[PDB]
């Protein structure tokens, strides 16, 4: 019979053995394992998405995207295990290289030097450049999604909320609401909840930069509108111009109902941070998404000048187009598509 972890079957042998629990989520259960064929340590996620249309939709997206991406700062998929027939496929196992830690864990135990902050930010943005060049929005960047080895190599993982948004087509009104993790959620996810852009990822990165500078979240809202209050208590009330760029009448009126708050200077929040870092932080944590720095300009900022090298920063050969987005399909059809997409890894070992 198959190996078992905390009561859960983990049917990944004989290739992968010696399973150890790492964690679970809405995303499913993760274990470390040893790959006996390649003689390397791996992480394996067990997913059981097939009863829920939204879970299928997200599994197909994550798999399609990561199988097509090839970049040093994005975690690859090594293998995918599932049953040899569609009727028997209840579970899917995704295998990746095992990383030592993540940025969340690291910031619980360790004040980082400016050098490490600077180098981590470079790699986050280097990977994000590739991701945004493909027309993908990540939509869930946060410290626990940034995997690291102690060699200081960093990889972005967790593409479960990711999607394609082809810029030939206006997606206003058609994007999923309530994306990102609360503390890392851009204001326009609250105020333009169906019409936000890839700029939401730059915001998340700004939140991550702030956390690396101080070892605590910058906007720790306890709930949905309290998040926006935290944001506004640092940034101040938006300018008249910024308010006028908010098309949703209801959201702009909600803002106009709020009591005035003043901008708190970045150097009063971060008295010992490098000034270039704070300047870049400001540009990422800009309220108006149309004024927020974009990934290439962030990379080109003076804070990152010792790493910025557009000849060693790959972009996607073949950006995703609108074709790859019509995945709003019955969950049985999505299952068929997941089966097809994983077939390249069949057969698996006994």
């Amino acid at each position: 019979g198959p190996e078992m972890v905390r009561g859960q079957v983990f049917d990944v042998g004989p290739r992968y053995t010696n399973l150890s629990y790492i964690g679970e989520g809405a995303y499913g259960m993760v274990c470390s394992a040893y790959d006996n064929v390649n003689k390397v340590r791996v992480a394996i996620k067990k997913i059981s998405p097939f009863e829920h249309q939204t879970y299928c939709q997200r599994t197909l997206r994550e798999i399609k995207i990561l199988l097509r991406f090839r970049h040093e700062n994005i975690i690859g998929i090594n293998d995918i295990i599932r049953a040899p027939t569609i009727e028997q496929m209840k579970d899917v196992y995704i295998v990746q290289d095992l990383m030592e830690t993540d940025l969340y864990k690291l910031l619980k135990t360790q004040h980082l030097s400016n050098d490490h902050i600077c180098y981590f930010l470079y790699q986050i943005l280097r990977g994000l450049k590739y991701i945004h060049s493909a027309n993908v929005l990540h939509r869930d960047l946060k410290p626990s999604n940034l995997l690291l080895n102690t060699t200081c190599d960093l990889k972005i993982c967790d593409f479960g909320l990711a999607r394609v948004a082809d810029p030939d087509h206006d997606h206003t009104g058609f994007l999923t609401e309530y994306v990102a993790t609360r503390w890392y959620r851009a204001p326009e996810i609250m105020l333009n909840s169906k019409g936000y852009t890839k700029s939401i990822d730059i915001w998340s990165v700004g939140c991550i930069l702030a956390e690396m500078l101080s070892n605590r979240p910058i906007f720790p809202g306890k709930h949905y509108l309290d998040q926006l209050n935290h944001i506004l208590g640092i940034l101040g009330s938006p300018s008249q111009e910024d308010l006028n760029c908010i098309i949703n009448l209801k959201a702009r009126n909600y803002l106009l109902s709020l009591p005035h708050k003043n901008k708190v200077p970045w150097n009063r929040l971060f008295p010992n941070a490098d000034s270039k870092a704070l300047d870049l932080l400001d540009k990422m944590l800009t309220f108006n998404p149309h004024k927020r720095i974009e990934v290439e300009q962030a990379l080109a900022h003076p804070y990152l000048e010792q790493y910025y090298d557009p000849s060693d920063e790959p972009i996607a050969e073949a950006p995703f187009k609108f074709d790859m987005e019509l995945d709003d399909l019955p969950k049985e059809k999505l299952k068929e598509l997941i089966f097809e997409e994983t077939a390249r890894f069949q057969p698996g070992y006994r």
Partner: peptide, 17 residues
């Protein structure tokens, strides 16, 4: 977690030579 090495010992840094 602990034991974060010098940036010098990064695959990305080391290639750049």
């Amino acid at each position: 977690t602990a034991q974060l090495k010098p940036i010098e010992s990064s695959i990305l840094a080391q290639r750049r030579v």
